[PDB]
Amino acid sequence: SKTINIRNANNFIKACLIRLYTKRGDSVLDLGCGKGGDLLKYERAGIGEYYGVDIAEVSINDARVRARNMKRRFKVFFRAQDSYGRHMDLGKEFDVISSQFSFHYAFSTSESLDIAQRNIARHLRPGGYFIMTVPSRDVILERYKQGRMSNDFYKIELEKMEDVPMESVREYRFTLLDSVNNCIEYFVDFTRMVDGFKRLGLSLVERKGFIDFYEDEGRRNPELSKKMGLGCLTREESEVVGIYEVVVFRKL
Ligand SMILES: CN(CC[C@H](N)C(=O)O)C[C@H]1O[C@@H](n2cnc3c(N)ncnc32)[C@H](O)[C@@H]1O
Numbered sequence: 013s014k015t016i017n018i019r020n021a022n023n024f025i026k027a028c029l030i031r032l033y034t035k036r037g038d039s040v041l042d043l044g045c046g047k048g049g050d051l052l053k054y055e056r057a058g059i060g061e062y063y064g065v066d067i068a069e070v071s072i073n074d075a076r077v078r079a080r081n082m083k084r085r086f087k088v089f090f091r092a093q094d095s096y097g098r099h100m101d102l103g104k105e106f107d108v109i110s111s112q113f114s115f116h117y118a119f120s121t122s123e124s125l126d127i128a129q130r131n132i133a134r135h136l137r138p139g140g141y142f143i144m145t146v147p148s149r150d151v152i153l154e155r156y157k158q159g160r161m162s163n164d165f166y167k168i169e170l171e172k173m174e175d176v177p178m179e180s181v182r183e184y185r186f187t188l189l190d191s192v193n194n195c196i197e198y199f200v201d202f203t204r205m206v207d208g209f210k211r212l213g214l215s216l217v218e219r220k221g222f223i224d225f226y227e228d229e230g231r232r233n234p235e236l237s238k239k240m241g242l243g244c245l246t247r248e249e250s251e252v253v254g255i256y257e258v259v260v261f262r263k264l
Pocket of ligand 1: 043044046047048049065071093094095097111117
């Protein structure tokens with residue numbers, strides 16, 4: 013594939029994120045879990061329990077199979093439901109709630125983000141963490157102003173008719189080689205997210221771009237790097253990976 017380095021970079025960053033906020037025996041609530049790729053990662057992390065939730069039944073299906081045919085130590089749970097736009101009560105708290113490449117889908121509407129943030133807060137143990145990897149609105153708009161919103165690997169189209177402020181835009185279409193097609197994404201209203209979380213007892217403790225994060229952790233953990241071809245990136249690739257940022261909140 014032409015997206016291998018990108019995939020490896022993203023998994024690495026994700027692996028480092030997990031490594032940074034999870035301790036042995038932790039309980040993890042993976043939201044928008046998808047096919048459950050992070051299962052192997054949580055395994056190396058020695059977590060005690062893993063709960064996977066995704067609105068797409070088709071995704072949960074692959075996650076189940078995955079958890080079923082893998083050498084794992086933690087207990088596993090799965091549920092196919094909307095964890096952002098519909099009330100959720102799994103009946104227990106977690107040490108770490110993870111949303112990898114999907115919490116932005118929680119910004120469809122004002123009410124939607126509210127439910128989502130409230131769903132994260134009621135399932136998070138005091139002191140627990142909410143780790144995430146969301147697309148950066150600042151980045152996307154700046155690239156917008158550069159008139160360069162694509163290349164071989166991806167493409168982004170902002171939805172804005174005549175007489176419409178740029179800052180007014182709340183969604184765009186995203187396409188990634190060997191992945192989503194004209195997939196609609198909602199911009200992360202950072203300030204609204206932060207505030208909303210502050211009222212629920214969660215405060216921001218981290219926010220860094222994928223390239224710097226990639227670079228930093230890379231110069232501080234060369235071992236896991238080599239363990240997956242991680243050793244550099246082209247400019248085209250870096251632009252895809254450059255789209256995202258790491259954001260962590262903590263229930264204080
Ligand atoms: C990029 N997919 C996650 C991959 C996985 N988290 C990873 O890190 O590899 C995004 C997932 O978001 C999920 N999703 C979208 N909207 C919602 C929602 N409202 N509630 C739960 N999951 C959602 C989709 O079903 C999709 O599987």
